[PDB]
């Protein structure tokens, strides 16, 4: 199994479901969840660097899990 | 069979234990005469031992590696392998007698509670009322279930004293 294809696909897929699917739900839950730093971005949907890092972390973890499971040959 | 145990009717340690008990009893019996009271008492004890071992092996009890019987407490195993007489039937028997005594005492307390001096009826037992309730307590599960369905078995929250929290 190609690691580059799996990692790239997993990261891009979870970033896509985070930007176009679960963005509104996450924003609505974060608002009701209620010294800090405001991360302003030019994204029209407010997809800042923090959300990118979180979704990319989830995508990389899932991609590496898939690669490991396929590496075990089971 | 169950939990690696063998029936007492086919256990070697069980028979060896019975032979050990009969051997020590016979050894103690050899020091007396034949028509004396201690000899008759020892022979009676030996007969009791033989009957006890025969009855335990006849009941189908499960013995361990020590030659002693074991009880089956699981309702499924007891009702599936013929061991309901160990712990199931005596459990329901105790439940009947326990609820019997509890219901008789509860009925006596509730009956003497509405009288002028209940403390006198508590230290000095009213034998006629207690005897009547003792004889009437045979239908305790039926009366208790009927009391529970009517809502009269329990007392309300507002009528019970509690701490100031």
């Amino acid at each position: 199994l190609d690691p580059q294809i799996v990692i790239s696909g997993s990261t891009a897929a979870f970033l896509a479901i985070g930007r176009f699917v679960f963005l509104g739900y996450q924003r609505r839950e974060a608002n009701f969840d209620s010294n800090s730093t405001i991360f302003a971005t030019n994204d029209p949907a407010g997809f800042n660097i923090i959300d990118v890092a979180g979704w990319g972390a989830l995508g990389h973890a899932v991609g590496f899990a898939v690669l490991a499971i396929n590496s075990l040959q089971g | 069979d169950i939990a690696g145990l063998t029936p007492c009717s086919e256990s070697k340690a069980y028979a060896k234990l019975e032979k050990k008990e009969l051997k020590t009893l016979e050894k103690r019996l050899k020091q007396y005469e034949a028509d004396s009271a201690p000899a008759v008492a020892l022979k009676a004890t030996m007969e009791r031992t033989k009957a006890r071992f025969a009855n335990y092996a006849k009941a189908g009890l499960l013995c361990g590696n020590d030659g002693l019987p074991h009880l089956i407490a699981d309702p499924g195993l007891a009702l599936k392998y013929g061991h309901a007489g160990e712990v199931f039937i005596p459990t329901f028997g105790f439940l009947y007698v326990a609820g019997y005594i509890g219901y008789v005492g509860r009925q006596y307390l509730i009956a003497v509670k509405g009288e002028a001096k209940p403390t006198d009826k508590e230290i000095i037992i009213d034998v006629p009322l207690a005897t009547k309730l003792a004889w009437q307590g045979a239908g305790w599960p039926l009366a208790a279930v009927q009391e529970l369905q009517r809502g009269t078995l329990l007392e309300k929250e507002e009528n019970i004293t509690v701490s100031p929290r």
């Binding site: - | 009791r48 009957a51 006890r52 009855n55 335990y56 009941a59 009890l61 019987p69 309901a84 007489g85 160990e86 039937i89 005596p90 028997g93 508590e122 230290i123 000095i124 037992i125 009213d126 034998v127």
Partner: protein, 39 residues
């Protein structure tokens, strides 16, 4: 006799008679049914 029956109806006398009856019943049961371990 009323006072004597009232004295016999007290808690210790009733407890003594009841426990004697229960103990006697259990002893006689084990006497006529030696070594009952199961049903």
């Amino acid at each position: 006799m009323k006072d004597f029956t009232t004295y016999l109806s007290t808690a210790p006398v009733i407890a003594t008679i009841w426990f004697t009856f229960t103990a006697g019943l259990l002893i006689e049961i084990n006497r006529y049914f030696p070594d009952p371990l199961v049903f």
